Write a protein that binds this ligand. Structure first.
Ligand code: GDP
Ligand code: MG
Ligand code: MG
Ligand code: MG
Ligand code: MG
Ligand code: MG
Ligand code: MG
Ligand code: MG
Ligand code: MG
Ligand code: MG
Ligand code: MG
Ligand code: MG
Ligand code: MG
Ligand code: MG
Ligand code: MG
Ligand code: MG
Ligand code: MG
Ligand code: MG
Ligand code: MG
Lengths: 57, 401, 80, 93, 120, 109
RNA sequence: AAACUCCAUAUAUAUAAUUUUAAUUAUAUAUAAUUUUAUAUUAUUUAAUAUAAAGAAAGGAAUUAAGACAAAUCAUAAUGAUCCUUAUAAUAUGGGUAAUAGACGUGCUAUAAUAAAAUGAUAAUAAAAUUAUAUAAAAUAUAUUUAAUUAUAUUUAAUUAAUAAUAUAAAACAUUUUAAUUUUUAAUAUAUUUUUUUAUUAUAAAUAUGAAUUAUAAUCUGAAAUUCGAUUAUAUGAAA
RNA sequence: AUAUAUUUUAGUAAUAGAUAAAAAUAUGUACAGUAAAAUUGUAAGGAAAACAAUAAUAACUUUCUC
């Protein structure tokens, strides 16, 4: 069917592939989703501020 | 491409292991007994059934002999050789012998006779035929922690089994134990329910102790206990014997290697050390009549050690460890070993042997038919080198020249 | 001298002048062991016929000079 | 002639359902030539590595701060400059 | 049957001898030393080895220099020889005998396997 | 001996933090373990803010994922490394790369 | 040609204070055989076969004529003729004679069990020959935890020799082992084959043949071992 | 730590993006995008394999900020 070299190539391919290695989707509650949004937005704002500070300097 | 019936082995092995003793004449010969040696002093004698049973178990009858020639292994009694040795054994205070002689003279036969005598006179026999097995490295071994020496728990098991079977159980179970003994259990039955076997002091027996079956690492402990028990008991005599003791003497270091790659010393093993202790005045048996009978083999190497141990040569200090080990000599001197030289056959003895062979129908036609009997005997004596029994036998049967 | 004791095989050369000023050393020795004291010196080692230019290797330190000047021509067969 | 792995029918990733390849990675500490440790994410399972030949001991990366070796080892008792002066007559060339 | 470090082994094959036969880095002495370290009786057979015992030989084998790296050192040595305009390196490149031999006749083994990539 | 439409090697565009890490690894681990490497050439590059160089199969065995196990990788392949900057011209890009500990050896244009 | 000759043989004599001993020897001088005799059986007084009695009585070496082959040699050496004479004569340093497609002889080692390997210190059994341009003993050290073996180093005891050394001859013979071979091993029992037997379980075309080829480390000789020498060790283990 | 039973995993295989000029379904429909050449480079790579880069931001919307 397959050689040892062929097997090892398949194994190598598998290492890179998403076949049966990836978890379930990250589902959130609506409150949790909001909390996440507020975390991300604030962070983004902070990053923008920092960029402006550096740019201004 | 081999069947069960066909002979696949080499010659010596074949002669030992393929039963060609089957096709042989039944011979109503007299029976070997020390109490009635006066009757059968210079005659061929078959062993008793019990003796045979014991002797086979021990490992007295060996491969390179011509025991295939007859129905069962047979010897003759000899006034100069065997009878004299027996008398010495009976009489001496030390009772501690090494059977020396030239190759093929009949040392193993002498040992077999001594064993047979011991069997007759209600004695236990611990025979170590071929120490090469424990000395050369061809079975498992392990460094025990309690006993500061290397145990060998394949050989040991076999030796224990031989001891059990060679000796009768009535004599062996007359001995009560001195101490209590815990051992690891190793039965197929009750492995969950019985991981530990216990032998009590008065209730249990030496037979029971022998029948114990442990894991390899407790086998050496078991052996040690058994030896101690036998030393303690004064009810029955213990005949210890070691044939091919020449190998032991010469092979000072075994083929086994410890953790670091170097050869293990014979006295650092369990078996060889034990044997040495038995030889010397150290593990002293409580009973009288309890002997050690060692035997040299012409097969094995020769060197200065054994002569130096005996009253033969002065001690040269400069000769090498390989050709002279002084520790072994010292040990031999400690336990007063009086050597016994096996003498070569007389003319009359040779004649008697030849007559026996003729009766059994081993002689060739050119020997028997058209030849004077006395002349034939004289020729046989000449060709043996004046009565080397093996050589004589070879000339008789294995010549065809 | 091959054997480690009594080694190496030393020969007199115009070494110091070569070290001062890049003047190649025309050796007809071929059995002088290369040393650490001349790595990066230009040698012109004899080949029987013609002297061979070599800048002594940093790895050549153990070897002889004649080992890097191959005396015989590379064999071929005229397929006639 | 051409050595290959022959393809099976491809699995249909639906539009929107495609997920990004987040490979399994460990936080790995690299101690360089000197004792400066640096954390890097790595796919091979080894929490700690210490390096021998790095930029922090290479002369090119810090200018301000084995036949020869074998020879030195096995001609060490002699100690082989003075030796150069002894064995350098510049007459013959 | 009894696998150890990838190399297959028939039963009844004496361990040290078997190791010497199979593994590239080791001969007679090395195999004996390994056996001593692990504590197998000499002339013990490959079938007798328990699972813990097998692993320690593999653990021992792994600790010892073996196979591709050992081959690489020798291939590396020949690569080094080649790099420096050396006679030996030249012989290796051209598939002739290296050790000061005659080649007017009988130089067939050298031709067969005096490569830069030596071993296989 | 090359056909059309045959899978032959691979590429990967790194951007942001992974790219930065890869550069840091190149500077510290890999490019010092190359024995005789002077630098990236000063004649290398685009006309506008892009510099490049390549690693042999010998050089890839110094990467710690490769480096940790020689045994898993019997074969190993060289690679080209195209660095793309936000530089107007190439000398500016070279200067930037030097700031991140990349040595530059050749005679500049 | 044969014979005389030499070696070897048998016998005798001589010599050797039987510590230069091996008298079971060595070496001078003899004698001895190209053996003799008789009874018969075939072919014609003899000649072959057989038998018998008398004897130690049976080989090898050197010697290879005349002629021939215009056989080989001017590279052992010499000489004729001829050619070279700052070169075809003379000295040094390196290289070559050891190059490698195919081919051809001679050998060596192999392709394993009527055959290979370990071991064998009251050291199983020889002969012939060499040692002042030397032979190198015992013993110590390292390779190597014992020691022996083998190889080097250390240092020269003895003898320039029937006196000492090279040198404990080796096969032999004996025990052990041996893949191919589930023709074996090891766990249990088993027993009047016990260095072994039986039962039931598990043991699944180049090796534990061969030694080419190569890598590294040492050693030896020599002033020098790269082309281009010889050992030892650890790996490598083609072909067959 | 280990034994049995009952399960669960390991068949290890590529696209992860509405993919966009390597090759492959050549007719429908829906959605989206832009090619090529030449030039400058880069490990083997060379005139010729692959990858990168190569026209202009005025005004507009949102975000941060002086
Ligand atoms: N004393 C004796 N020996 C015998 C008799 N029958 C045979 N033998 C021989 O005795 C020999 C045993 O001798 P042994 O000393 O064991 O030989 P070694 O093993 O070489 O020492 C055997 O080879 C037998 O052939 C007998 O009736 N009496
Ligand atoms: Mg015997
Ligand atoms: Mg090997
Ligand atoms: Mg003549
Ligand atoms: Mg004498
Ligand atoms: Mg003539
Ligand atoms: Mg002629
Ligand atoms: Mg001629
Ligand atoms: Mg002339
Ligand atoms: Mg001339
Ligand atoms: Mg010359
Ligand atoms: Mg020649
Ligand atoms: Mg000839
Ligand atoms: Mg053979
Ligand atoms: Mg000596
Ligand atoms: Mg002498
Ligand atoms: Mg001998
Ligand atoms: Mg083959
Ligand atoms: Mg071999």
């Amino acid at each position: 069917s397959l050689s040892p070299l062929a097997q090892r190539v398949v194994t190598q391919l598998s290492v890179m592939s998403a076949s049966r290695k990836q978890p379930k989707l990250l589902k959130l509650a609506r409150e949790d989703l909001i909390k996440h949004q507020t975390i991300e937005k604030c962070w983004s704002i902070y990053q923008q501020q920092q960029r402006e500070r550096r740019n201004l300097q | 491409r081999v069947t069960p019936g066909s002979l696949y082995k080499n010659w010596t092995n074949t002669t030992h292991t393929a039963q060609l003793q089957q096709t042989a004449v039944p011979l109503a010969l007299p029976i070997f007994n020390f109490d009635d040696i006066s009757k059968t002093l210079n005659k061929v004698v078959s062993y008793s059934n019990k003796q045979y049973k014991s002797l086979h178990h021990l490992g007295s009858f060996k491969k390179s002999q011509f025991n295939e020639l007859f129905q069962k292994p047979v010897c003759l009694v000899r006034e100069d050789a065997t009878n004299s040795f027996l008398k010495k054994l009976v009489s001496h205070p030390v009772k501690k012998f090494i059977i020396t002689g030239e190759p093929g003279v009949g040392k193993t036969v002498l040992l077999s006779q001594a064993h047979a005598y011991a069997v007759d006179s209600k004695q236990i026999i611990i025979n170590i035929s071929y120490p090469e097995l424990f000395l050369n490295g061809r079975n498992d071994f392990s460094y025990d922690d309690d006993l500061k020496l290397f145990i060998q728990p394949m050989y040991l098991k076999k030796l224990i089994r031989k001891i059990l079977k060679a000796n009768d159980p009535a004599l062996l179970k007359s001995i009560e134990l001195s101490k209590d003994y815990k051992f690891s259990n190793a039965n197929p039955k009750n492995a969950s329910v019985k991981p530990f076997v216990t032998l009590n002091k008065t209730k249990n027996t030496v037979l029971d102790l022998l029948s114990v079956m442990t894991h390899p690492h407790n086998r050496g402990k078991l052996m040690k206990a058994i030896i101690d028990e036998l030393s303690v008991q004064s009810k029955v005599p213990i005949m210890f014997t070691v044939d091919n003791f020449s190998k032991v003497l010469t092979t000072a270091y075994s083929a086994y290697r410890n953790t670091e790659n170097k050869q293990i010393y014979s006295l650092d093993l369990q078996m060889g050390k034990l044997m040495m202790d038995i030889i010397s005045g150290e593990t002293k048996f409580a009973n009288g009549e309890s002997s050690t009978i060692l035997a040299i083999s012409g097969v094995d190497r020769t060197n200065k050690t054994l002569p130096v141990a005996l009253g033969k040569i002065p001690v040269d200090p400069y000769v090498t460890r390989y050709h002279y080990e002084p520790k072994f000599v010292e040990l031999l001197q400690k336990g007063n070993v009086t050597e016994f030289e096996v003498p070569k056959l007389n003319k009359q003895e040779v004649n008697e042997l030849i007559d026996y062979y003729k009766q059994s129908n081993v002689l060739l036609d050119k020997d028997i038919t058209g030849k004077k009997w006395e002349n034939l005997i004289d020729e046989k004596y000449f060709l043996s080198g004046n009565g080397n029994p093996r050589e004589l036998l070879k000339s008789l049967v294995l010549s065809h020249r | 001298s091959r054997s480690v004791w009594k080694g190496p095989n030393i020969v007199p050369l115009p070494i110091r002048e070569a070290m001062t000023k890049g003047t190649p050393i025309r050796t007809n020795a071929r059995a002088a062991t290369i040393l650490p004291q001349f790595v990066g010196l230009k040698f012109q080692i004899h080949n029987g016929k013609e002297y061979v230019p070599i800048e002594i290797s940093e790895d050549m330190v153990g070897h002889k000079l004649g080992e890097f000047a191959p005396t015989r021509k590379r064999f071929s067969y005229t397929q006639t | 002639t051409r050595i290959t792995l022959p393809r099976r029918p491809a699995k249909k990733i639906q539009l929107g359902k495609s997920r990004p390849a987040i490979y399994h990675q460990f936080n790995v500490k690299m101690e360089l030539s000197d004792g400066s440790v640096v954390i890097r994410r790595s796919q091979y399972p080894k929490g700690e590595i210490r390096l021998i030949q790095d930029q922090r001991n290479n002369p090119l990366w810090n200018p301000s701060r084995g036949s020869l070796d074998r020879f030195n080892k096995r001609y060490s008792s002699l100690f082989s400059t003075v030796e150069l002066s002894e064995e350098n007559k510049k007459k013959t060339q | 049957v009894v696998h150890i470090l990838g190399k297959g082994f028939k039963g009844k094959e004496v361990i040290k001898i078997a190791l010497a036969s199979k593994f590239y880095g080791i001969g007679k002495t090395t195999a004996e030393k390994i056996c001593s370290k692990l504590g197998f009786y000499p002339w013990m057979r490959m079938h007798q080895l328990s699972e813990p015992q097998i692993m320690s030989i593999a653990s021992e084998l792994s600790t010892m220099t073996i196979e591709g790296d050992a081959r690489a050192i020798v291939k590396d040595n020949i690569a080094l020889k080649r790099k420096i305009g050396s006679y030996s390196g030249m012989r290796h490149t051209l598939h002739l005998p290296v050790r000061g031999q005659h080649t007017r006749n009988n130089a067939k083994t050298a031709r067969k396997l005096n490569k830069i990539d030596r071993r296989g | 001996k090359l056909r059309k439409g045959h899978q032959m090697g691979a590429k990967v565009e790194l951007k942001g933090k992974e790219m930065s890490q890869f550069l840091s690894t190149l500077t510290e681990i890999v490019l010092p373990r190359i024995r005789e490497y002077k630098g990236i050439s000063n004649q290398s590059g685009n006309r506008f803010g892009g510099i490049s160089f390549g690693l042999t199969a010998e050089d890839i065995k110094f990467f710690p994922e490769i480096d940790a196990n020689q045994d898993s990788w019997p074969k190993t392949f060289g690679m080209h490394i195209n660095i793309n900057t936000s530089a107007q011209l190439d000398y500016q890009a070279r200067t930037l790369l030097s700031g991140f500990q990349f040595p530059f050896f050749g005679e500049e244009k």
